[PDB]
Amino acid sequence: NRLESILSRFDADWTASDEARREAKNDLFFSRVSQWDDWLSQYTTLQYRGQFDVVRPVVRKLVSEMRQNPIDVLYRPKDGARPDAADVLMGMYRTDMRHNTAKIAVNIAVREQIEAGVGAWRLVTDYEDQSPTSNNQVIRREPIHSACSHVIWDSNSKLMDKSDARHCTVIHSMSQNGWEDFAEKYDLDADDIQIAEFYEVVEKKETAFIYQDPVTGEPVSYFKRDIKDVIDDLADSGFIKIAERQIKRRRVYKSIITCTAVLKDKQLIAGEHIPIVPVFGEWGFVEDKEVYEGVVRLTKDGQRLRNMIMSFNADIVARTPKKKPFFWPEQIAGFEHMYDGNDDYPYYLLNRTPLAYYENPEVPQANAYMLEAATSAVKEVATLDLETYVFQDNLATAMRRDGEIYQSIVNDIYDVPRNVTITLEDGSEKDVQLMAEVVDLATGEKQVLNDIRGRYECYTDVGPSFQSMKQQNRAEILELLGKTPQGTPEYQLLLLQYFTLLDGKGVEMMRDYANKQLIQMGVKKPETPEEQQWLVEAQQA
Amino acid sequence: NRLESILSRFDADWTASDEARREAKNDLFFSRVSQWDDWLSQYTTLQYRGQFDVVRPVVRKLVSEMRQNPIDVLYRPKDGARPDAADVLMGMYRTDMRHNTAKIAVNIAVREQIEAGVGAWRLVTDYEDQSPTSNNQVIRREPIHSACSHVIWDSNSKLMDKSDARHCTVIHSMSQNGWEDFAEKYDLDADDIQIAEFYEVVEKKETAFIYQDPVTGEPVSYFKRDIKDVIDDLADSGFIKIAERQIKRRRVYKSIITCTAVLKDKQLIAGEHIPIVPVFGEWGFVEDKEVYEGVVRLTKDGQRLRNMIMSFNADIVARTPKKKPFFWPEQIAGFEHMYDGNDDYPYYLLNRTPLAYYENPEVPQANAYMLEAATSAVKEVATLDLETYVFQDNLATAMRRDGEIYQSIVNDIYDVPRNVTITLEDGSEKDVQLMAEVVDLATGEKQVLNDIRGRYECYTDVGPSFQSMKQQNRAEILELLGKTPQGTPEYQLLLLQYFTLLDGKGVEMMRDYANKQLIQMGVKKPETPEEQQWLVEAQQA
């Protein structure tokens, strides 16, 4: 009976999102296969069906604009978590998003966002460091291709993160080969080929009936049955009722079903949220129906008009310009070897009983402005900001959902003492241990160092990229150097700070000299004992 | 029966990729042989089929624009490997990618990426230093020509690296002569001519059933049979079960088969991955079908329109402009020697019983904008960024796959103490020994120096080339020299650092003087004992 409930929910979601999925699939097929939909091939008579598109330049420009305004993910430390743990999570997320597989997933999701309207990349977990001694795991992102048709979000949820959604499938259209490999890979090779991955979020909601006493109110009456266990204590306490806080606890469950046969895996736990994170284009609710778009429908209509115009011109062209004449069979009764085009004779002969020709088509020459209007419509209705704010905000919201999912999975995996790599800002690689059980020297307590496990909320700061920040800083410092009298310690400090803001391999010695001069000057704090020795040597000099 | 399984897999892959291979072959044939496909030769009547193409200028611009933004491959050192081994692999990959054969392979792959959509160059290994004393091997890259039709990737893999692909053939369409040479070269001259190279990746997957004790959990129950060997120990241990880490181990296998006759070689090992690395153009999944494109389909339609327009013009031109008249045979009964064009007579005679002419075609003069629209479409729909980001990103991803394959092969061949050449950055060539078994002086341990063998993952940094970095550095230093008061040690340091950033042979003497002054100043660290003597001479002076 369980599979009947699963398929009822899946069919409800499918039929509810059918219209949006149809239009998105048509958009994707238009932007990747052929501009000439079947409707258009019915309403037309043109014989040279061509595709002189200007959509892909627009999509490329939009993707490039997004790529040039990178989005970072931060972490607010909550419930008294130390800022250093927040920094460690920021670094681990940065190094798990700079990994090339994650870049491929994000790029595919963005491209299908801009073209179709939905991209929906996915999170997944797997082991590293292949050896049975440990059980270390990492986080990589497998993209979901054509996510407008292979991901069926819960129709009921009404948030763009799809946070409220309590289930979302991932259809896989497998043939025989896909069948046996994706069957032997995980569960069993039991034959029944469209398989599914029905994610699920199960929750436990109660009342918890907080009660108050002279002392601070501890959790009492956690259930309704505990109330019936304290029928006397509820009346013997100082206060009878204060609040009805409905405590909630949730865990994500994953099941692999099939349409015909029974489900293959009943329930499995992986993380806390459903890993699939969707991106959407211009997304909103119209008459209580989810509708999402891209930058391909509008350019699609314009592009169909342009294709029609250019195909019409090509249809005019591909006719031999030589005139075809009209005359009676007895008008050339004998003289038929003259009119073949295989020879050119001085004069043309016609017997007893002057002729009319077949009118070739003429180019309207009014199609100049027509074509220009269509092409300009495609090239401006789509784009032109400095980045399409709606698409950038949508990507930011989806990346924040990705941050929440990644943080929860990190919280639930990074438990065992581990060694991880952290990409601090400015690409500075670093190595950090997670637990670092070392006992303090002057304190006497245990004081585990990092202890990533906690509770965190994600918030993204879209805007000035770090390299752009540094370039603007260098420009400002150079301007000040232009507008400051020389010799004064302010000028020397500004020049030294400009030195320390330079680039890498070429001027490394200048940057190192600047650091030495700053530290021995006393403005920049030392960070290593050699710098401390330099500082004391300069001071005592 | 083995060959039947091989051919089943190969036929499945072939029929699954048939549509994409057909369209890519048509694209390549259009961009290298003749613009006039057979379809167009059916829908047309023009007699002068011409090719006034503007596709190849676009492809040339794109390839050059790639060439001006070179991609480097880096190496993250993992599992506690020293950074010096990482630097040695960095330089070794650089010197194996700067070799001319590798440049030919990469150039052919990129050219076929831009034209057709797939380039798929190939890794291969062979001996150097021909002498039986040793067995040293090197890595060179043999290009695969027309890779859209001679390489059939596994249909089931779903990554642009084709990393997931677990087999991939390489068809060779050989005639008799190719048959005997490619048969005697490796296996045997046993006659059966399309031969194949069926690469394969086999894996061993188990459960490994980690068990935990008071001490750290060592690898126990590596197999399921070892569990049945410890039926007592599993119950006598402190903990019964913690995790089920499915350890995996993979190794490549290569087999040379033929369609009709039996396979020639059953299995051979070469490296760890399948050497073939593909590049793709705009690549994505549409309705669960692999579709990849180039910059030739869109320009292809535009180019067909331009060809038709100019051929129409040329068909108008090639006619005698002399008018051909229409008149009865008895209208010139006697005077037939007048109308031949072989003479020019003063007057023209006509007997008893004024005439009509044959209308030559006229140039519509509306074709000006037609031709301009078609040509401009070809020249802008294709290109215009500063590099086509999708093509550059795909090349970067393929080069990262090349890095992984090269690193696996280097790890698996460079075991014996060898001597290699390293191309450090800025072309500074260097000779380095790999093992360098020298025992330490003040330590007392063995401490092999480089020991390339390890476990590295590749990551590419596409962007500013090193020469561009140096030119920008020189520009910045020159600007500071323009905006800094003279005499001060900062100005002198800037001038000397500008000196040390100059070019080669011409100004070597100033660069050497600058190094001497920097080292005697104490800013740049000495790198050789003569510089140390210079430093102490300057200091004690």
Author numbering:
A (entry chain I), B (entry chain J): 6 to 197, 217 to 377, 388 to 418, 443 to 599
Reproduce, without paraphrasing, sentences from the article in which this PDB structure was first reported.
Tailed double-stranded DNA (dsDNA) bacteriophages and their eukaryotic counterparts, such as herpesviruses, possess a dodecameric portal at a unique vertex of the capsid; this portal serves as a channel for DNA packaging during viral assembly and delivery. The portal interacts with multiple copies of a scaffolding protein (SP) to form a nucleation complex, which initiates the assembly of the major capsid protein (i.e., coat protein) and other minor proteins into a procapsid. The P22 procapsid consists of an icosahedral coat comprising 415 coat protein (gene product [gp] 5) subunits, a dodecameric ring comprising portal protein (gp1) subunits located at a unique capsid vertex, and an internal core comprising approximately 250–300 SP (gp8) subunits and 3 ejection proteins. In this study, we present the structure of the SP gp8 in complex with the dodecameric portal in the P22 procapsid at subnanometer resolution.
Asymmetric reconstruction of the portal at a resolution of 8 Å revealed its overall 12-fold symmetric structure, which was similar to a previously reported lower-resolution structure of the procapsid portal (EMD-1828). The C-terminal helical barrel domain (residues 601–725) appeared unstructured. Structural comparison of the procapsid and mature virion portals revealed major differences in the following domains: (1) the top region of the wing domain, which interacted with the SP complex (described below); (2) the stem and clip domains, which likely interacted with the terminase complex motor during DNA packaging; and (3) the helical barrel domain, which was absent in the procapsid. The portal’s helical barrel is fully established after the maturation of the phage P22.
